[PDB]
Design a protein around this motif. Structure first.
Motif, mmCIF file in Angstrom:
data_model
loop_
_atom_site.group_PDB
_atom_site.id
_atom_site.type_symbol
_atom_site.label_atom_id
_atom_site.label_comp_id
_atom_site.label_asym_id
_atom_site.label_seq_id
_atom_site.Cartn_x
_atom_site.Cartn_y
_atom_site.Cartn_z
ATOM 1 N N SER D 6 0.841 -1.180 0.000
ATOM 2 C CA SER D 6 0.000 0.000 0.000
ATOM 3 C C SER D 6 0.886 1.244 0.000
ATOM 4 N N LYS D 7 0.510 2.252 -0.787
ATOM 5 C CA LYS D 7 1.346 3.438 -0.940
ATOM 6 C C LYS D 7 1.426 4.243 0.353
ATOM 7 N N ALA D 8 2.562 4.922 0.541
ATOM 8 C CA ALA D 8 2.762 5.823 1.672
ATOM 9 C C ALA D 8 3.893 6.792 1.364
ATOM 10 N N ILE D 9 3.843 7.956 2.001
ATOM 11 C CA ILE D 9 4.838 9.002 1.811
ATOM 12 C C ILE D 9 5.535 9.273 3.132
ATOM 13 N N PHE D 10 6.848 9.453 3.079
ATOM 14 C CA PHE D 10 7.629 9.724 4.278
ATOM 15 C C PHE D 10 7.644 11.232 4.514
ATOM 16 N N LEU D 26 7.685 9.539 10.394
ATOM 17 C CA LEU D 26 6.251 9.767 10.229
ATOM 18 C C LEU D 26 5.832 9.429 8.809
ATOM 19 N N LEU D 27 5.034 8.382 8.676
ATOM 20 C CA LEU D 27 4.499 7.951 7.397
ATOM 21 C C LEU D 27 3.082 8.465 7.258
ATOM 22 N N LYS D 28 2.739 8.919 6.068
ATOM 23 C CA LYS D 28 1.373 9.324 5.777
ATOM 24 C C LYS D 28 0.811 8.307 4.795
ATOM 25 N N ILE D 29 0.218 7.241 5.327
ATOM 26 C CA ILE D 29 -0.355 6.226 4.456
ATOM 27 C C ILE D 29 -1.532 6.821 3.699
ATOM 28 N N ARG D 45 5.354 -4.247 7.832
ATOM 29 C CA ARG D 45 6.687 -3.915 7.341
ATOM 30 C C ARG D 45 6.615 -2.829 6.283
ATOM 31 N N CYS D 46 7.576 -1.915 6.316
ATOM 32 C CA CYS D 46 7.700 -0.891 5.290
ATOM 33 C C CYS D 46 9.086 -0.956 4.674
ATOM 34 N N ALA D 47 9.286 -0.144 3.645
ATOM 35 C CA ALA D 47 10.445 -0.333 2.796
ATOM 36 C C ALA D 47 10.724 0.972 2.063
ATOM 37 N N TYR D 48 11.701 1.724 2.532
ATOM 38 C CA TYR D 48 12.263 2.726 1.650
ATOM 39 C C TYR D 48 13.023 1.984 0.564
ATOM 40 N N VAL D 49 12.712 2.269 -0.695
ATOM 41 C CA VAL D 49 13.344 1.585 -1.817
ATOM 42 C C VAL D 49 13.950 2.620 -2.744
ATOM 43 N N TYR D 50 15.221 2.431 -3.074
ATOM 44 C CA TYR D 50 15.970 3.435 -3.809
ATOM 45 C C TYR D 50 17.145 2.755 -4.485
ATOM 46 N N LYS D 51 17.736 3.451 -5.457
ATOM 47 C CA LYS D 51 18.823 2.884 -6.244
ATOM 48 C C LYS D 51 19.972 3.870 -6.363
ATOM 49 N N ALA D 52 21.208 3.364 -6.266
ATOM 50 C CA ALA D 52 22.350 4.275 -6.364
ATOM 51 C C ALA D 52 23.581 3.552 -6.928
ATOM 52 N N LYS D 53 23.722 3.585 -8.257
ATOM 53 C CA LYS D 53 25.003 3.715 -8.959
ATOM 54 C C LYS D 53 26.008 2.576 -8.748
ATOM 55 N N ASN D 54 25.740 1.653 -7.828
ATOM 56 C CA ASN D 54 26.619 0.513 -7.596
ATOM 57 C C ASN D 54 25.772 -0.734 -7.434
ATOM 58 N N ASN D 55 26.280 -1.862 -7.909
ATOM 59 C CA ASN D 55 25.486 -3.080 -7.874
ATOM 60 C C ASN D 55 25.485 -3.728 -6.504
ATOM 61 N N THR D 56 24.303 -4.163 -6.087
ATOM 62 C CA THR D 56 24.071 -4.704 -4.759
ATOM 63 C C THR D 56 23.252 -5.978 -4.876
ATOM 64 N N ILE D 100 7.644 5.456 0.403
ATOM 65 C CA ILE D 100 8.001 4.205 1.048
ATOM 66 C C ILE D 100 6.791 3.300 0.888
ATOM 67 N N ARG D 101 7.016 2.012 1.079
ATOM 68 C CA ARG D 101 6.046 0.985 0.732
ATOM 69 C C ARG D 101 5.710 0.212 1.989
ATOM 70 N N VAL D 102 4.581 0.495 2.612
ATOM 71 C CA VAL D 102 4.136 -0.407 3.663
ATOM 72 C C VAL D 102 3.543 -1.644 3.008
ATOM 73 N N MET D 103 4.031 -2.800 3.408
ATOM 74 C CA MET D 103 3.587 -4.052 2.830
ATOM 75 C C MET D 103 2.400 -4.585 3.616
ATOM 76 N N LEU D 104 2.074 -5.849 3.390
ATOM 77 C CA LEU D 104 1.017 -6.507 4.129
ATOM 78 C C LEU D 104 1.493 -7.695 4.948
ATOM 79 N N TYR D 105 2.704 -8.201 4.706
ATOM 80 C CA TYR D 105 2.946 -9.600 5.039
ATOM 81 C C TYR D 105 3.051 -9.963 6.524
ATOM 82 N N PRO D 106 3.458 -9.083 7.467
ATOM 83 C CA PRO D 106 3.361 -9.495 8.874
ATOM 84 C C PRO D 106 1.929 -9.382 9.382
#
Ligand SMILES: [Mg+2]
Ligand SMILES: [Mg+2]
Ligand SMILES: [Mg+2]
Ligand SMILES: [Mg+2]
Ligand SMILES: [Mg+2]
Ligand SMILES: [Mg+2]
Ligand SMILES: [Mg+2]
Lengths: 190, 138, 175, 109, 247, 201
Positions: D6-10, D26-29, D45-56, D100-106
């Motif tokens: 479910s969408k959310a903003i930090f 503070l998340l604003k779901i 569970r939530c998840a800041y998800v981002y990408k930067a320039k090096n492989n992980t 950020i992404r609040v999930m459902l799984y827990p």
RNA sequence: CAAGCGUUCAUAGCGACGUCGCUUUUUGAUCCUUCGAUGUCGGCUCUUCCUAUCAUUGUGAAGCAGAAUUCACCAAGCGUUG
RNA sequence: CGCGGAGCCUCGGUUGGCCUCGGAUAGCCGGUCCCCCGCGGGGUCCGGUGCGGAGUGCCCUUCGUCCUGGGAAACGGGGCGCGGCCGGAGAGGCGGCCGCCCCCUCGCCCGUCACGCACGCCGUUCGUGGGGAACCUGGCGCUAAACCAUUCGUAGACGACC
């Protein structure tokens, strides 16, 4: 204190037909048609009377300063009926001591020309509002007649020429010169 | 112009608050913002209730200005408010807001399929009526 | 003193017995307050103004609520008053049209605040008394006061203005 | 093949006016605007998800360009349906006003 | 404290980013409001200041001391050869301003008009407007400049005409013609426009723009004088003779 | 919510709308306030014109060109009031002001998109009917705006073109409701299972 | 506030006996800032600002007939010298 | 312009919604039998809606693939599929509408089986042929100006400018 209800009924005569577009009344009789919005006054205009007999204005849960607005609409409507049945006729007489005030109309009304006020060179021109037919009278010496249907249009045109003929830098207790509204009447009396 | 007047006997649908989603008959007017209100058959005890939380219907009934819970039980029983409401459209879009919130994930899937076919049979016709409105234009 | 929703805590109390007078009189006041502890305290404020009695040389005998005998029947309350304006102190009579003596002076306390900026510590309730139809002087109450009462609800603003905070349809206010 | 998050903003970190506490965020779901409404997302569970320039590296996959800070919702925040959540590392202030992404799984249904 | 004896200020602020002007040919900052009933005409022209001289004329202003007397008047003479029209330009009205639609130059252009396109000429190959001129004879000689005049007819409001001087008729050492947009204060665009479509590649003499004893405005650049002291620039007072550091 | 927002500024209150816009810009969402000439301010007209002219008299004396920039177009007036509610002195504050986009009148692509309303900022809701108020269009004119006339003649040309769109869309719904009734026995058990779950009643 | 002046008439213009304020262009009081120094009078020049308006635009007052003149209002746009 | 192969880098996003005007002590839609104007617009009558169901509390479209073999649905969809006519200018940047070729048969119920079933676990799923920076194929076009140096003064402290 809010007053629960105040109202007032207008007695519409048989010559006229009033039909309200929600809050904008339109009034047509023999002489012509008049219209006036009231989308500032926040009242209920009902047409309860049948065949056509009553314009009834409510106000509703209003306090002192709006209950006053009830009758002022009531009167603005009778003035509309009295203007489309008979028509207003404001008379104004010219007053002076020495220099004769020299009036002449120039289109049909629409241009009242005043020469020689207090001897002044500058010729005063005065438009009329639309629908006001100014005319130089007869059966009187110095006298204009402003006719028409809207009290609002006629009487401010009267003021337009009553206020155009004003003296400057004098004692207007002594210099009683100008064209003054002398008689607020009607066209037909019935 | 108005057509629904706070009266002695007007039936009102309670918008929100503790009694939300029930009917009520206005027994008496207390003040500019409060009415002595009673829904007998909709299970609302006689109590005061602000107008700001009730929207009033087209029904009336005919008990007097301070009747006592037994005469307003009549005139609500007869004239049958409880079956004339539920014949309003009001009571049919209510009980549609109710039925979307009360909808399993399975149901939500049946309508996803049903509506997809409905929307297509109606779409082939509109394409066919325009074919006829263009041929009539010819 | 402060507020809440006021209640009718009535109190009685005597000046505890000395050797000389062994059976002092009892006094019931209709104190009018948000709970016990202050209804006891408003008592000693009013008995010290009337009798030569104090909280030390006395005792409260009974404190208990008196609760409305007809709470489902609208009544007309006149209530005599005495407060303290910024200049002097004035007496009043005011009328409120609610259906419980307690709530009727809860309204009054709200008005002296609203119409005279008089806080609760300045006001004194002389005596509340429910009235019949006539004997009502204030036309603010005297207007409902009939049988075929009738209003519309003309300019019905919508609350819920933050349920949907963004919407396509402009609202409506006529119903 | 859709959200599952479910969408959310930090919006910011838990703060006073002239203080700021960076552990809690503070998340604003989206689509929830009452402190009564939000008792569903407690514990998610939530998840800041981002990408930067090096492989992980990536569980169940090859080295991507994507990384996450990895969090969990604690409790509601104020009447308006905000949500207090603390991630395992602290969020980088770059994500202020981002997804950020609040999930459902827990899940606790 | 206050000023003891008051006095006006020196030099108007209504002029005062008093810098070397950024242009050279006088730019018209506002053209007259186009009354769309009178016929089509040009509103501006482009002349060259030559010198001055005395005039002798009779005066007719009755009631003055010099009625039916002879006076002398100093007059400038602005040498003004006929200007040539080369292109037209369209403008359309926006909230954000008054934008430009479509510039359409003629088939030929000039020689003097080319000069105004490159800084150094004799080093260049003179290629300007050598493929735009190609449009004026082919199938696309109807797309880009016949649907365009119809476009400028539909959506345009104000139409100016780009016109350049003839620098070869003057005694001057210059040959870079001076272009300028001269708004057409006619009436009814598509009449405002099917008049300049005609005058492309055409001469326009001064007697078309201006008539005798007509009040005009002159729009040029002041004569240059360089860096100047506060006394010459703003016309201040000079301090007394004794002042240690400059007067 | 989600994607690009379009707010139609008419019937709205200058600050009431600006407070809600500025919070949604700071949450990364892209806002486009349109028709800002219809925005109106509470309090009678002269009260606001006089209040604006007091702003113009605020100007750095020793040199005005650096001084406070009193914009005149309604959008910039409104954009100013949103900027007064963002931390524009920092990086997130300026980054916000770029997600905003304010127009006078209603230009292309946004003229062909459904635009929404903020009732918590709307005039018919926050204001009492018996009060006076001014339009940011008129206010801007007497303060020195130059294009009240043009932005009016342009929107009358668009109000005539969009009336055509609606009248055709009004006619397509006339075919839908007539085709719904002309084919209503092979969608009968479909419209059935729509109204059992509240859809389509 | 108003006893009175103003032929008569409190308040056109004034106004005693009293009383409430504003102002920092007067002088004082005070000694907070500066004594490892803030150059401590006027005049000259130059800018800008205030209005507690002398003129001029627009006005209302007069014990304003005209002329002249006082009283007051919106007003600091532009003046105010040898 | 088309469509080809690798490689730094900068990041956000992870179905759309393609639109009247406005009123708010009123509106919305139908239908017009009738009347006026330029398929429409205006008017009058009537009929339905109005805590709005031709309701952003909304609407649209689907989200494992394929087989084949029945029913309901049946010419839809496509090949950067191809040409022509429109409409749109406020900062247009988008659609819309017509011919021809080839190809496909796809929404809803059912049967019928299959598709790495990776063995309970995370950045999955897209706008993405993203934006930018460097390099390997084909076709059509291309063919400079600017600054200095010099010169001039209509310009100048030098710069700059004509
Ligand atoms: Mg005089
Ligand atoms: Mg990714
Ligand atoms: Mg001075
Ligand atoms: Mg010396
Ligand atoms: Mg006397
Ligand atoms: Mg020093
Ligand atoms: Mg003053």
């Amino acid at each position: 204190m809010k007053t629960i209800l105040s109202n007032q009924t207008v007695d519409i005569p048989e010559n006229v037909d009033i039909t309200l577009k929600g809050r904008t009344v339109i009034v047509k009789g023999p002489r012509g048609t008049l219209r006036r919005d009231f989308n500032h006054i926040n009242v209920e205009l009902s047409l309860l009377g049948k065949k056509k007999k009553r314009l009834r204005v409510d106000k509703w849960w209003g306090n002192r300063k709006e209950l006053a607005t009830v009758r002022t609409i009531c009167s603005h409507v009778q003035n509309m009926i009295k203007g489309v049945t008979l028509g207003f006729r404001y008379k104004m007489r010219s007053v002076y001591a020495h220099f004769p005030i020299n009036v002449v109309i120039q289109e049909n009304g629409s241009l009242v020309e005043i020469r020689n006020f207090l001897g002044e060179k500058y010729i005063r021109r005065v438009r009329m509002r639309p629908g006001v037919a100014c005319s130089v009278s007869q059966a009187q010496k110095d006298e204009l007649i402003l006719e028409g249907n809207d009290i609002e249009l006629v009487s401010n045109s009267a003021a337009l020429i009553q206020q155009a003929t004003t003296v400057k830098n004098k004692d207007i207790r002594k210099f009683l010169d100008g064209i003054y509204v002398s008689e607020k009447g009607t066209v037909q009396q019935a | 112009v108005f057509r629904r007047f706070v009266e002695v006997g007007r039936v009102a649908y309670v918008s929100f608050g503790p009694h939300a989603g029930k009917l009520v008959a206005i027994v008496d007017v207390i003040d500019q913002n409060r009415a002595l209100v009673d829904g007998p058959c909709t299970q609302v005890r006689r109590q005061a209730m602000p107008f700001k939380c009730m929207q009033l219907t087209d029904f009336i009934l005919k008990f007097p200005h301070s009747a006592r819970q037994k005469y307003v039980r009549k005139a609500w029983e007869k004239a049958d408010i409880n079956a004339k409401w539920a014949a309003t459209r009001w009571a049919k879009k209510i009980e549609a807001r109710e039925k979307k919130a009360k909808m399993t994930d399975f149901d939500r899937y049946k309508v996803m399929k049903a509506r997809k076919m409905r929307n297509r049979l109606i779409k082939l016709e509109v394409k066919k009526l325009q074919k006829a409105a263009l041929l009539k234009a010819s | 003193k402060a507020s809440g929703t006021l209640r009718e805590y009535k109190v009685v109390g005597r000046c505890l017995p000395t050797p000389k007078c062994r059976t002092p009189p009892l006094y019931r006041m209709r104190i009018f307050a948000p709970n016990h502890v202050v209804a006891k305290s408003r008592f000693w404020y009013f008995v010290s103004q009337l009798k030569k009695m104090k909280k030390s040389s006395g005792e409260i005998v009974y404190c208990g609520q008196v609760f409305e005998k007809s709470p489902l029947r609208v009544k007309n309350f006149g209530i005599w008053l005495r407060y303290d304006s910024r200049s002097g102190t004035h007496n009043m009579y005011r009328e409120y049209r609610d259906l419980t003596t307690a709530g009727a002076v809860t309204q009054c306390y709200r008005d002296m605040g609203a119409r005279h900026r008089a806080r609760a510590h300045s006001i004194q309730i002389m005596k509340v008394e429910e009235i019949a139809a006539s004997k009502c002087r204030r036309p603010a109450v005297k207007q409902f006061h009939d049988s075929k009462i009738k209003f519309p609800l003309p300019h019905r603003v919508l609350r819920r203005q933050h349920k949907p905070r963004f919407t396509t349809k402009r609202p409506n206010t006529f119903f | 093949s859709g959200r599952l998050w479910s969408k959310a903003i930090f919006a910011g970190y838990k703060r006073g006016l002239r203080n700021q506490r960076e552990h809690t965020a503070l998340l604003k779901i989206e689509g929830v605007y009452a402190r009564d409404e939000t008792e569903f997302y407690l514990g998610k569970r939530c998840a800041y998800v981002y990408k930067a320039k090096n492989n992980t590296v990536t569980p169940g996959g090859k080295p991507n360009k994507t990384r996450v800070i990895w969090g969990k919702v604690t409790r509601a925040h104020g009447n308006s349906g905000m949500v207090r959540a603390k991630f395992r590392s602290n969020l980088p202030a770059k994500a202020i006003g981002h997804r950020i992404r609040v999930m459902l799984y827990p899940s606790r249904i | 404290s206050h000023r003891k004896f008051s006095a006006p200020r020196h030099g108007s602020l209504g002029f005062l980013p008093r810098k070397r002007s950024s242009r050279h040919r006088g730019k018209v900052k506002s053209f007259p409001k186009d009354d769309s009933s009178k016929p089509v005409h040009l509103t501006a022209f482009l002349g060259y200041k030559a010198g001055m001289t005395h005039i002798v004329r009779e005066v007719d202003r009755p009631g003055s001391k010099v009625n039916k007397k002879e006076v002398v008047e100093a007059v400038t003479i602005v040498e003004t050869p006929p200007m040539i029209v080369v292109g037209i330009v369209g403008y359309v009205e926006t909230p954000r301003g008054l934008r430009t639609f479509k510039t359409i130059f003629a088939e030929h252009i000039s020689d003097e008009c080319k000069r105004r396109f490159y800084k150094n000429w004799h080093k260049s190959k003179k290629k300007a407007f050598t493929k735009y001129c190609k449009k004026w004879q082919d199938a696309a000689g109807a797309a880009a400049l016949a649907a365009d005049f119809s476009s400028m007819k539909a959506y345009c409001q104000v139409i100016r005409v780009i016109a350049h001087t003839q620098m070869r008729l003057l005694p001057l050492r210059q040959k870079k013609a001076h272009l300028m947009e001269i708004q057409v204060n006619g009436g009814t665009v598509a009449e405002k426009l099917d008049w300049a479509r005609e005058r492309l590649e055409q001469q326009v003499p001064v007697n078309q723009v201006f008539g005798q004893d007509e009040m005009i405005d002159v729009i040029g650049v002041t004569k240059g004088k360089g860096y100047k002291g506060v006394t010459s620039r703003w016309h201040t007072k000079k301090l007394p003779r004794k002042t240690h550091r400059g007067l | 919510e989600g994607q690009v927002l379009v707010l139609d500024g008419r019937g709205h209150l200058l600050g009431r709308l600006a407070a809600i816009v500025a919070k949604q810009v700071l949450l990364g969402r892209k806002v486009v306030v349109v028709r800002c000439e219809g925005i109106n301010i509470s309090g009678n007209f002269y009260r606001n014109k006089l209040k604006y002219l007091a702003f113009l008299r605020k100007r750095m004396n020793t040199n005005p060109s650096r001084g406070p920039y009193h914009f005149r177009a309604p959008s910039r007036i409104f954009w100013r009031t949103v900027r007064g509610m963002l931390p524009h002195k920092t990086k997130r504050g300026q980054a916000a002001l770029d997600r905003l986009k304010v127009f006078d009148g209603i230009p292309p692509p946004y003229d062909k998109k459904k635009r929404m309303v903020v009732p918590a900022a709307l005039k018919v809701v926050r204001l009492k009917p018996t009060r006076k108020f001014a339009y940011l269009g008129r206010l801007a004119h007497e303060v020195g705006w130059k294009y009240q006339a043009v932005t009016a003649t342009l929107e009358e040309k668009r109000k005539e073109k969009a009336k055509i769109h609606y009248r055709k869309k009004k006619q397509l719904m006339r075919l839908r409701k007539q085709a719904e009734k002309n084919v209503e026995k092979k969608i009968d058990r479909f419209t059935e299972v729509l109204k059992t779950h509240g859809f389509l009643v």
